[PDB]
Design a protein around this ligand. Structure first.
Ligand SMILES: Cc1ccsc1C(=O)O
Ligand SMILES: Cc1ccsc1C(=O)O
Ligand SMILES: [Zn+2]
Ligand SMILES: [Zn+2]
Ligand SMILES: [Zn+2]
Length: 455
């Protein structure tokens, strides 16, 4: 129960149009052999090219939808489509490229996967909705063997060069022509009734079938993301650090304490309705306010209807919606909403305009909808501190800022402690906003109300 067994049966019904006469009884072992690969009982870390649905989830940062549409079978040319939007045409002699022989097409393939995956994964997983031509064309750009390391580093090998006879990871594969030891998963194996467009369109309106190979590769990875993260949710799976994860989360916790602390001092609300995560703590532990919690897990499909969340006196005080994505927020709210459109290593394309935000855990977030914040306004940057002006020791330059709400800045000149803490909070703030998060507050929020908290 560790890897997908080669002796597992492979349903070949979806392959019998490109491959007429294919035996109904087939195993992964006979399929791989039929594809043109000799897996000579190698106990060297590569037991099967194909992988389980569970292993594919653990390696979602590696998912690349792959589809091959035979333009005219080694007699006819092939359109090679990928979920990166790329379409390469191979000749046997929405970026649509002209016909070229396999020996140049394979070099282009290694460049695209290396540039796409170098910052997200140690491997590639080809997400397939197999009809025959994609598995048979793999021998033209893929080499398999024992697990290896890069010739320039310690990472596992993902590419191979016939010119130099050496192996490399995604970072050092410049000039490499083969894809070494890739992984793959056929979505049609998961038990679907109907074609890719019928099944995909049941959940996604954002990807259209333009009848190009890349459009199918995109609908495939989309349907695979839906089945594993939108409808099935497993927040037990941990994901490795691949970027600023630790700083982004520490920033979110610092921002949350600051934003909520200031809203309670500015408008002195008597009750705070904490709507969201059931494992949440008071972000402002010393706060005078009556803190009441309401459990709601992160919605991965559609955004929560604010009516189905409330139907008890939510109009009294303020409502804290920290990463709790509702359809239209009440006027009396403090909100942090992840913006799914953000470009980052943590954010992977999602289903129906949503995104798969992978930071320790995979959170498929619904599409960012600007109309959710009609009764709110964008919360502006501000740094508030009521702590004493005590240094306790980096080199200084006098800080001048209107948004340093401190006793020292009220007094006229900001102390070194609040200047250091202001720039540290500005860095945590900018870190969080760039990671894709967006802050919104009730229209009455005015930081001018915080100057009177030191009197
Ligand atoms: C406010 C309240 C009280 C009992 S269930 C509920 C809800 O919001 O679902
Ligand atoms: C392991 C891991 C990955 C992202 S956050 C994190 C942690 O230790 O908090
Ligand atoms: Zn390397
Ligand atoms: Zn889609
Ligand atoms: Zn000060």
């Amino acid at each position: 129960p560790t890897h997908l067994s080669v002796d597992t049966k492979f349903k070949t019904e979806g392959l019998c149009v490109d491959i007429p006469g294919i035996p109904k009884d087939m195993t992964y072992r006979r399929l791989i052999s039929m594809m043109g690969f000799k897996m000579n009982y190698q106990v060297n870390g590569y037991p099967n090219m194909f992988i389980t649905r569970e292993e594919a989830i653990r390696h979602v940062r590696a998912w690349i939808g792959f589809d091959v549409e035979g333009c005219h079978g080694t007699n006819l040319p092939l359109q090679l489509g990928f979920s990166t939007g790329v379409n390469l045409v191979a000749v046997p002699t929405p970026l649509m490229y002209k016909g070229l022989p396999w020996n140049v097409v394979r070099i282009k393939i290694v460049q695209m996967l290396s540039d796409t995956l170098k910052n997200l994964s140690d491997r590639v997983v080809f997400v397939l909705w197999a009809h025959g031509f994609e598995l048979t064309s793999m021998k033209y750009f893929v080499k398999i063997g024992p697990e290896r390391t890069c010739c320039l580093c310690d990472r596992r090998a993902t590419c191979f060069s016939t010119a130099s006879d050496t192996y490399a990871c995604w970072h050092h594969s410049i000039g490499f022509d083969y894809v070494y030891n890739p992984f793959m998963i056929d979505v049609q194996q998961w038990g679907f009734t109907g074609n890719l467009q019928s099944n995909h369109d049941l959940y996604c309106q954002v990807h259209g079938n333009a009848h190009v190979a890349s459009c199918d590769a995109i609908m495939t990875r989309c349907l695979a993301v839906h089945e594993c993260f939108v409808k099935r949710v497993d927040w037990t799976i941990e994901y490795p650090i691949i970027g600023d994860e630790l700083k982004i989360n520490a920033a979110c916790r610092k921002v949350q304490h600051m934003v909520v602390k200031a809203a309670l001092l500015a408008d002195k609300f008597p009750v705070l309705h904490d709507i969201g995560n059931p494992k949440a703590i008071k972000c402002v532990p010393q706060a005078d306010v009556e803190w009441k919690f309401y459990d709601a897990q992160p919605c991965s499909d559609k955004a929560y209807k604010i009516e189905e969340l409330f139907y008890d006196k939510f109009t009294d005080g303020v409502c804290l919606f920290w990463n709790c994505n509702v359809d239209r927020y009440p006027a009396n709210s403090i909100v942090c909403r992840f913006d799914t459109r953000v470009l980052s290593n943590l954010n992977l394309p999602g289903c129906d305009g949503g995104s798969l935000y992978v930071n320790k855990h995979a959170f498929h977030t619904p599409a960012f909808d600007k109309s959710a914040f009609v009764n709110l306004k964008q919360l502006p940057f501000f740094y508030y501190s009521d702590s004493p002006c005590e240094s306790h020791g980096i080199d200084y330059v006098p800080l001048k800022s209107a948004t340093c709400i401190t006793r020292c800045n009220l007094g006229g000149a900001v102390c070194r402690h609040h200047a250091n803490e202001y720039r540290l909070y500005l860095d945590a703030y900018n870190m969080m906003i760039s990671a894709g998060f967006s802050l919104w507050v009730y229209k009455q929020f005015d930081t001018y109300n915080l100057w009177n908290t030191f009197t």
